[PDB]
Design a protein around this ligand. Structure first.
Ligand code: A1EQ3
Ligand code: NAG
Ligand code: NAG
Ligand code: NAG
Lengths: 32, 49, 474, 467
């Protein structure tokens, strides 16, 4: 039962990391 | 070269002794636009059509 | 405190990614290669052979021939290797139109004492003080003394040069031969005479290499007391509705964004009706409503802007010989606003910190420990990496063709890291001690040296977490 | 007291390292690559004939070899890259004798001879063909300065039927035609060597070239080549005087190191081979002593080639020089690696570097204990792949080839176009069960150890600092 709890609990952090990824990715093209 | 292509590979494919029964003749529906195009400067394509 | 912090936090994060995606999509900024070059080709050129009489510093009030028969003449007849060719990056479109705002007699009352010296000069913009008689030599309407109020044009309300709804103006032909003849006729005569306060012109462009529309407005405000002020307002406008496999993803993102705005607007009305109302002194309920209000805009603007742009671009052929095609000025009046409104809330929306403290940036600047650790690893990784490069260059120097020059062994090893091994001749060049190199390099680069980097990252994250927890729980 | 001795040791080590780095880098001239590349492109890429394309790299029959020895070989050797010949080329043949099986009695009536795979006990020492001269009479290994070669299939001996060609094109062509007219490349042949050397007076660089053709007992042809350039004057300008000075100071440095080591081991009778920084210093010293011995050996006899630029008429035996040059390079390239690695004891002066050092010194035991359990599974998969695919893929032919192929798979360089078609069942099973047990399980264990030990050591070190 823990394999679902440990994935539903860490969702905000994963979304934050993905947000960091996408903002750095759009920055990578904004200097062009 | 489209005309030689069709005359050489496609027409022998459609007809023949038995040659892959077709069930239907072909068609060549075609559009014109009416807005005559002009060739681009030298080079295949710059960005897009 | 167990649902919301786990619900609108996640919703806001997904909202953030969704908006950033079509922010990227919108972020074309081809102007730096399509409007900067276009402006330089139209505003950085010498009117004379070599002087300062360019568009940056206007030549003179009596330089009508020197100005119009210059870069301006290089717009109607742009001849390169009557014509449209400047730098092989733009073409012509529509029909030129130049407005000569002549402030004729009416500048000041003329008494019987000293009116014989001067009483009609280029004064401030007015109605009964503008061009009322021929602004100099003109047999008929060359210096047209008529008010073009019915010209379907709105005054620009310029600060440096006051703009009115009337003023002498004329258009050019589909080429420059007639335009040059008219300019010469008006220079031998007087139409842009000393009474002319400022001159205005508008133009369009095609630029078939990068399909778009360009709207340019040029203003020369030659003050009567001397000098001249240049103004160049040029901006693009394109239509890429649906031809590609990526813009459809942008349309889907826009639909998802509209659904998110609906979700946030159907959610905010309940916070005012059921929940106690007239309570906004929180600075947090304030952003929630203003963001939604601004987001409603640019949704009924983007659709309207697209529809209007498509409608205008549809009639792009009948202006070859038409009198005037400079009615697109109304379009930019919106296009820049949506260009501004879109950045008047994307910051504001990203300006929401209810979820995590703003002043707690002390753990985003004390992470220099991570940077320091990452530097004591690059000097412990390059020593092992250079020793292997030297060994490869000494063993495989003469045979492989990749470990030939020391500057090439580095790139070969980096390609090996990226999974681009060849191993067809590394082993062929030396049956023993050759595969040993590759095997030990792989074992020490992917198993024992790569993972210390991940351990460092892991420890940095754990330390940041622990410090933040200790600080916030103290 | 600690700082003074440590800085003295560090400065001495830096002088040693810089001397070694200058000495090794002054031995690499960029023209050696160009020379070998052009030699290979001339002798191995040009078509055998005008109307054919089967170059020496793609020989496919015992008849194409006879065209090569009259086509690209003569043209490249007796050119119009701008090199000149010295001595005379030599061609040698290794054969086996008839009757080397115990043929099964059942079908002994149909077949009549074996030419078994090459071995010392099955070599053909009897004369054959017209008993003219050396080309048809067995010559002992000792009579002719020979040694083993370790070809692709097996290691060959130094004996065999040899023949020395002539200097110009006509006589060599006539001799080759005479060999072809008779049956010199019989069905019993097992190896063919062609050896010679050139000077290329344009740039001072000897070149010793050896071509080998192998005929396996199952038909076919296997070509191989070896080109070794050499520079054996070494006294021409100021640079090589600087090089000699560096050589002598390097000898003095290694003398100082070895005497220090012998004194140290005299002090500590044992328990000296555990610090692991002495076990590496002794390896460096031994490697340097071997390198200096090889250098002395290969520089003692260099004059022998000097009386070959006088255009003699004989075969210059130059195998030892090339072999010892290769060996000396393969020793220098490892002593440099180890002396560079040894530098990991003088960079603990910082704080982060000290933590990394103690981390790696504290998780070495677990890493070594786990590299055994990893390599056992690795070898099990290697043996499985060798047994299943060891006949038809060509990537699992030998045993070590399986290990190298698996290592390349770890880097993500699988082909899978032949694994699945060589064995539709038990091949994909191997591929799938290999990725699940490596990228998911067995490569997430090194990181776990390195992730736990780093945190533990940082905690302990920080507590000690705050203690
Ligand atoms: C409440 C708590 C549990 O007790 C949950 C913890 C969630 C939290 C770790 C998540 C939530 C949003 C994430 C940030 C993102 O919004 C944009 C960025 C910018 C980027 O340059 C770096 C990264 C950063 C700061 C992210 C850092 C991690 C964050 C702060
Ligand atoms: C018979 C033959 O060619 N064998 C040679 C011999 O001539 C030479 O004297 C010797 C070295 O001196 O090397 C071997
Ligand atoms: C090889 O030896 C066998 C043994 O009897 C003999 O019959 C055969 O003729 C030999 N081969 C040749 C080519 O003579
Ligand atoms: C072998 O015989 C003699 C020397 O033994 C020599 O003159 C002759 O040319 C050689 N070749 C042949 C085919 O006789």
């Amino acid at each position: 039962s823990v394999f679902g709890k440990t994935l539903c609990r860490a969702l905000p952090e994963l979304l934050g990391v993905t947000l960091g990824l996408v903002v750095l990715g759009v920055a990578y093209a904004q200097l062009a | 070269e489209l005309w030689p292509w069709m005359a050489h590979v496609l027409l022998p494919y459609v007809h023949g002794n038995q040659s892959s029964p077709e069930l239907g003749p072909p068609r060549l529906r075609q559009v014109r636009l009416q807005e005559a195009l002009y060739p681009d400067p030298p080079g295949p394509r710059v960005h897009t059509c | 405190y167990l649902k919301s912090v786990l619900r609108e936090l996640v919703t806001y994060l997904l909202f953030l990614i969704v908006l950033c995606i079509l922010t990227y999509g919108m972020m074309s900024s081809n102007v730096y290669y399509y409007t900067r070059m276009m402006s330089q080709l139209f505003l950085d050129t010498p009117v004379s052979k070599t002087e300062k009489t360019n568009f940056k510093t206007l030549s003179s009030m009596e330089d009508f021939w020197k100005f119009t028969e210059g870069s301006l003449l290089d717009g109607l007849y742009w001849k390169m290797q009557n014509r449209s060719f400047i730098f092989y990056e733009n073409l012509l479109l529509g029909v030129p139109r130049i407005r000569q705002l002549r402030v004729r007699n009416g500048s000041c009352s003329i008494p019987q004492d000293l009116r014989d010296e001067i009483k009609e000069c280029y004064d401030v913009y007015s109605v009964s003080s503008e061009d009322r008689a021929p602004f100099g030599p003109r047999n008929g309407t060359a210096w047209i003394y008529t008010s073009e109020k019915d010209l379907n044009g709105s005054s620009h309300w310029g600060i440096i040069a006051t703009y009115s709804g009337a003023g002498y103006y004329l258009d050019l032909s589909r080429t420059r031969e007639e335009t040059a003849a008219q300019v010469a006729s008006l220079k031998k005569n007087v139409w842009l005479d000393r009474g002319t306060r400022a001159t205005f012109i508008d133009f369009s462009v095609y630029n078939a290499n990068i399909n778009l529309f360009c709207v340019v407005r040029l203003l020369v405000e030659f003050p009567a007391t001397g000098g001249v002020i240049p103004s160049w307002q040029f901006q693009p406008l394109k239509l890429i509705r649906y031809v590609t496999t990526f813009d459809f993803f942008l349309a889907a993102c826009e639909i998802i964004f509209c659904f998110f705005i609906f979700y946030y607007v159907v959610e905010e009305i309940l916070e005012i009706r059921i929940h106690k109302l007239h309570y906004f002194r929180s600075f947090w309920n304030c952003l929630d409503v203003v963001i939604v209000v601004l987001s409603v805009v640019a949704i009924g603007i983007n659709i309207y802007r697209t529809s209007n742009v498509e409608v205008l671009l549809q009639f792009l052929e009948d202006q070859n010989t038409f009198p005037n095609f400079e009615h697109l000025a109304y379009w930019q009046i919106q296009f820049n606003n949506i260009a501004a409104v879109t950045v008047f809330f994307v910051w504001i929306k990203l300006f929401k910190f209810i979820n995590f403290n703003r002043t707690m940036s002390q753990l985003s600047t004390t992470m220099s420990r991570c940077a320091k650790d990452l530097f004591g690893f690059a000097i412990m990784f390059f020593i092992i990496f250079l020793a292997y490069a030297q060994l490869a260059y000494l063993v495989f120097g003469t045979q492989v063709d990749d470990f030939s020059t020391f500057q090439e062994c580095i790139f070969t090893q980096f390609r090996i890291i990226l999974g681009d091994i060849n191993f067809a001749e590394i082993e062929e060049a030396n049956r023993v001690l050759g595969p040993i190199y590759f095997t030990t390099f792989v074992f020490f680069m992917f198993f024992i040296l790569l993972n210390m980097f991940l351990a460092i990252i892991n420890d940095t994250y754990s330390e940041v977490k622990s410090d933040l927890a200790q600080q916030k729980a103290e």
